[PDB]
Amino acid sequence: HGKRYRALLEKVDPNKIYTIDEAAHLVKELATAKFDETVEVHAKLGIDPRRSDQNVRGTVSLPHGLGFRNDKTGAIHAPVGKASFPPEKLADNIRAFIRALEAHKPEGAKGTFLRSVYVTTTMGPSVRINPHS
RNA sequence: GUGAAAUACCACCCUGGCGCGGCUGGGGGCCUAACCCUCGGAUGGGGGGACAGCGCUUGGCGGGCAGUUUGACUGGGGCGG
Ligand SMILES: [Mg+2]
Ligand SMILES: [Mg+2]
Ligand SMILES: [Mg+2]
Ligand SMILES: [Mg+2]
Ligand SMILES: [Mg+2]
Ligand SMILES: [Mg+2]
Ligand SMILES: [Mg+2]
Ligand SMILES: [Mg+2]
Ligand SMILES: [Mg+2]
Ligand SMILES: [Mg+2]
Ligand SMILES: [Mg+2]
Ligand SMILES: [Mg+2]
Ligand SMILES: [Mg+2]
Ligand SMILES: [Mg+2]
């Protein structure tokens, strides 16, 4: 890689599990990008994609504005916006969409579901965050 | 742009691979000091050796033994029915 996140990886730690509100505020400072940062935080899920009965879909737009689908490998992705929103508001938006997921969580789906959510951007790292606290 | 999927820095995952480490399971070899055998001698020497033996536990083979079962009707009983 470059020195983009080799300047930035000694301040942000993947090893020791973290929670949202303390690890939420660093998402715009962790991206050294030149342009237009669109943050994406994600976790994979414990449902077997090999059966379509357990899949999940929809379109639910976020309150704040532009600026959910599971794959066949069983992870989850979604855009939360554009550069736009600041660092301290996302404790409000970092628990926002994350509670729209579990709405359509399947019943015959087996296992702990939000597994490892790593707060990231298009431009950014692996850092542990709790889905809840 | 004629394949529908886009060839960026990223993370989050699939599949096989190596790499380190964490809990590890399995194999091999050598060693002696437990344990076993032995030695005119021994707090020692030689041999076998963590096997074997012995305890607890697992499943198996098991008339060598043990306890028993092996029906009634019936022109006697069995055989047949
Ligand atoms: Mg030897
Ligand atoms: Mg010896
Ligand atoms: Mg001796
Ligand atoms: Mg000896
Ligand atoms: Mg020897
Ligand atoms: Mg033994
Ligand atoms: Mg008998
Ligand atoms: Mg018998
Ligand atoms: Mg008899
Ligand atoms: Mg009779
Ligand atoms: Mg008669
Ligand atoms: Mg008669
Ligand atoms: Mg008769
Ligand atoms: Mg008869």
Side-chain angles (χ1 to χ4, degrees):
Chain A
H1 301 352
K3 252 278 193 56
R4 218 138 284 90
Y5 223 91
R6 198 31 278 168
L8 281 32
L9 194 62
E10 261 153 35
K11 62 192 191 187
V12 159
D13 217 345
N15 74 284
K16 143 87 166 297
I17 314 161
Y18 269 163
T19 72
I20 357 189
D21 190 30
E22 47 114 55
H25 302 315
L26 18 157
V27 72
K28 302 191 77 52
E29 187 272 329
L30 269 33
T32 26
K34 214 193 322 299
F35 69 123
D36 221 328
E37 57 166 341
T38 63
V39 303
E40 39 184 18
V41 179
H42 35 231
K44 79 305 286 75
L45 241 88
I47 183 46
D48 201 31
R50 315 167 71 258
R51 289 304 184 87
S52 302
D53 38 45
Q54 295 151 132
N55 281 12
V56 171
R57 289 300 182 277
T59 46
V60 286
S61 65
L62 206 67
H64 325 285
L66 164 68
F68 57 103
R69 144 176 265 240
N70 59 61
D71 39 61
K72 202 155 293 176
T73 147
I76 274 309
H77 342 282
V80 250
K82 292 277 169 49
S84 285
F85 240 179
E88 254 249 306
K89 98 288 149 358
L90 54 128
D92 160 55
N93 195 20
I94 206 160
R95 297 164 182 91
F97 168 55
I98 214 68
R99 312 308 173 210
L101 279 317
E102 335 202 2
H104 203 1
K105 143 185 51 181
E107 308 174 354
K110 303 313 302 135
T112 58
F113 284 135
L114 318 193
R115 330 265 265 181
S116 75
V117 211
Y118 271 62
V119 152
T120 305
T121 62
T122 314
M123 304 98 197
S126 81
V127 57
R128 4 80 172 210
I129 65 106
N130 194 295
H132 303 330
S133 298

